[PDB]
């Protein structure tokens, strides 16, 4: 019988390679004109110490290196892109530093000279964070970094360092969404109460390899001199999370989950009364100032009742 020919090594390597690329679910930006645009929209990187997260092939890395950068540190998790990055460092004498690490855990507190550090109320320091990461990494990273801004530590020991990151279109939308909008949610409050957030532009998915199912939003973030809420991050996070869980219901329904059932009617009413908020407002209409009132009242309630802050309504429902 006539059987199909054997696959060559080229075909075997191709079959493994193409499937290895799809395996980590990423979107490479090979358009140097686009990576130039991201860098351009981020502002002037002249004499700025730049931290790039997940450089990969090095598209943005190249665009950063061509921008009068004082120094560029990159942290790369995949060791397969490390050789090419080293090659790129060779073309730029003393401009590139490479680390094989995880951005979710790597500390940059001392990666740059302490002299470039600035006061919080000062102008933003000569540190800038830029990166195009996979969607699974970018989302928890900003949430980690928002908490760092709250604590004024981590990347923000240098001061109010800027961020220019890519997010999936919908996430980028929520980050900048104003009150009343359908995309106004947790990320909206969590980012805006700590940062000035600007949606620079949106890159269509066609420009990425391989092609993602969605478009990619480019967002610029700058920490505020005075945060809109002055409570612990985890407290703000819990109130915001509970407020937005039932989107089609009165905010009273969601905020009520902060309190044990035996006190829920009275405490939820008291919370909204003291915070001076209409109990019938849908969560989408809750502004940063509404949450400041909710958080401040909830804080006083927690200080009065130490059982309150670690209450979880799911555990009670079981
Ligand atoms: C979609 S590529 C982006 C690279 C570049 N922006 C581009 O498109 O040309 C994402 C890169 O980030 C790296 N990466 C993913 N998760 C990471 C993590 N947790 N820490 C550090 N790097 C990570 C991967 O190695 C991958 O090369």
């Amino acid at each position: 019988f006539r059987l199909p020919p054997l696959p060559t090594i080229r075909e075997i390597i191709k079959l493994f390679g193409l499937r290895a690329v799809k395996q980590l679910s990423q979107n490479f930006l090979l358009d140097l004109r686009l990576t130039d645009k991201i860098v351009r929209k981020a502002g002037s990187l002249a004499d700025v110490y730049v931290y790039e997260v997940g450089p990969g092939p090095g598209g943005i890395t190249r665009s950063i290196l061509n921008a009068n950068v004082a120094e560029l540190l990159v942290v790369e998790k995949d060791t397969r892109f490390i050789p090419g990055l080293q090659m790129l460092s060779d073309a730029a004498p003393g401009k590139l530093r490479i680390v094989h690490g995880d951005v979710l855990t790597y500390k940059i507190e001392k990666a740059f000279p302490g002299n470039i550090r600035r006061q919080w109320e000062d102008d933003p320091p000569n540190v800038h964070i830029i990166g195009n990461l996979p969607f699974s990494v970018s989302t928890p990273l900003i949430i980690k970094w928002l908490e760092n801004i709250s604590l004024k530590d981590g990347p923000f020991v240098y001061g109010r360092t800027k961020m220019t990151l890519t997010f999936q279109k919908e996430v980028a939308e929520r980050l900048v969404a104003t009150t009343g909008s359908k995309q106004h949610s947790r990320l909206s409050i969590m980012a805006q109460y700590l940062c000035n957030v600007e949606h620079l532009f949106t890159i269509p998915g066609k420009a990425f390899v391989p092609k993602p199912k969605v478009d990619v939003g480019v967002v610029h973030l700058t920490p505020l001199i005075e945060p809109k809420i002055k409570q612990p991050f985890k407290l703000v996070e819990k109130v915001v999370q509970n407020a937005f869980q039932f989107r089609r219901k009165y905010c009273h329904r969601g905020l009520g989950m902060l309190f044990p059932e035996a006190q829920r009617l009275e405490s939820t009413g008291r919370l909204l009364q003291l915070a001076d908020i209409d109990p019938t407002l849908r969560p989408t209409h809750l502004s940063l100032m509404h949450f400041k009132s909710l958080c401040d009242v909830y804080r006083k309630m927690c200080d009065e009742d130490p059982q309150l802050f670690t209450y979880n309504f799911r555990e009670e429902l079981k």
Side-chain angles (χ1 to χ4, degrees), residues 2-8 11-13 15-17 19-21 24-32 34-67 69-169 171-173 175-181 183-210 212 214-247 249-281 283-299 301-303 305-317:
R2 183 69 67 176
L3 302 182
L6 278 178
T8 68
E11 302 181 336
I12 290 186
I13 290 183
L15 180 135
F16 283 3
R19 189 180 172 275
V21 177
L24 35 61
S25 185
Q26 293 173 351
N27 330 281
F28 303 116
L29 197 55
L30 295 319
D31 198 338
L32 280 187
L34 273 181
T35 61
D36 280 341
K37 185 180 181 182
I38 296 180
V39 168
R40 177 175 62 85
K41 292 303 225 65
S44 181
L45 295 178
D47 296 320
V48 178
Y49 296 78
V50 174
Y51 175 30
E52 186 192 353
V53 287
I60 303 185
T61 320
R62 285 160 170 80
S63 302
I64 293 177
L65 286 170
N66 293 128
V69 127
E71 201 169 10
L72 169 59
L73 160 68
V74 300
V75 168
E76 173 56 50
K77 205 191 185 189
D78 202 322
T79 196
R80 288 174 268 175
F81 289 104
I82 296 296
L85 291 171
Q86 256 298 334
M87 175 199 310
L88 196 68
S89 182
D90 290 332
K95 291 302 177 184
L96 183 61
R97 309 148 76 179
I98 304 169
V99 175
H100 178 216
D102 192 333
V103 294
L104 292 163
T105 71
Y106 184 85
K107 301 183 186 181
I108 67 166
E109 257 98 333
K110 303 196 168 307
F112 304 122
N115 54 34
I116 70 181
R117 293 184 176 185
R118 301 298 172 83
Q119 299 293 99
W120 192 256
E121 35 279 327
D122 217 331
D123 276 333
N126 269 272
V127 182
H128 198 135
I129 302 180
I130 310 179
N132 166 244
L133 284 165
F135 304 151
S136 60
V137 179
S138 61
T139 288
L141 182 60
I142 192 61
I143 296 181
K144 168 191 184 297
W145 278 346
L146 284 179
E147 184 167 9
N148 287 137
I149 295 165
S150 174
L151 288 161
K152 297 176 183 178
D153 66 346
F156 310 96
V157 296
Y158 298 100
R160 301 183 295 115
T161 82
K162 314 169 187 177
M163 289 150 282
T164 302
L165 299 163
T166 69
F167 297 93
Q168 31 183 149
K169 192 204 210 304
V171 165
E173 286 177 357
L175 285 167
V176 311
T178 55
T179 174
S181 166
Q183 292 291 69
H184 194 247
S185 48
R186 309 178 308 103
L187 283 174
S188 304
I189 304 304
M190 300 310 289
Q192 293 169 30
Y193 100 89
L194 288 165
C195 294
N196 181 81
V197 190
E198 319 174 36
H199 189 149
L200 298 184
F201 66 99
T202 295
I203 307 181
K206 295 175 292 297
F208 297 92
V209 183
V214 269
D215 299 321
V216 171
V218 183
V219 180
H220 184 86
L221 300 92
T222 313
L224 302 175
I225 296 117
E226 189 195 63
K228 307 302 179 57
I229 312 176
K230 284 161 184 172
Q231 296 296 348
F233 182 89
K234 302 302 291 185
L235 181 143
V236 178
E237 192 185 43
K238 190 181 184 189
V239 173
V240 172
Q241 182 205 282
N242 282 276
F244 282 106
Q245 58 192 133
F246 317 118
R247 288 191 59 92
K249 306 287 184 172
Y250 298 148
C251 66
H252 186 277
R253 318 288 189 184
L255 294 167
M257 298 311 101
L258 288 168
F259 307 101
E261 304 186 27
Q263 73 180 86
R264 186 167 298 162
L265 175 72
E266 184 186 14
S267 291
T268 312
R270 184 164 161 85
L271 170 66
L272 285 168
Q273 187 186 24
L274 295 176
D276 194 32
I277 304 184
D278 188 343
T280 54
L281 282 183
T284 191
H285 296 299
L286 291 179
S287 67
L288 293 169
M289 286 299 113
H290 281 149
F291 278 108
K292 184 189 183 305
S293 298
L294 287 172
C295 289
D296 291 349
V297 171
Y298 179 67
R299 175 59 192 274
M301 290 178 166
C302 286
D303 293 334
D305 183 11
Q307 285 175 324
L308 196 62
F309 188 65
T310 54
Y311 168 77
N312 168 254
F313 76 98
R314 309 182 193 277
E315 279 293 331
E316 183 173 28
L317 289 179

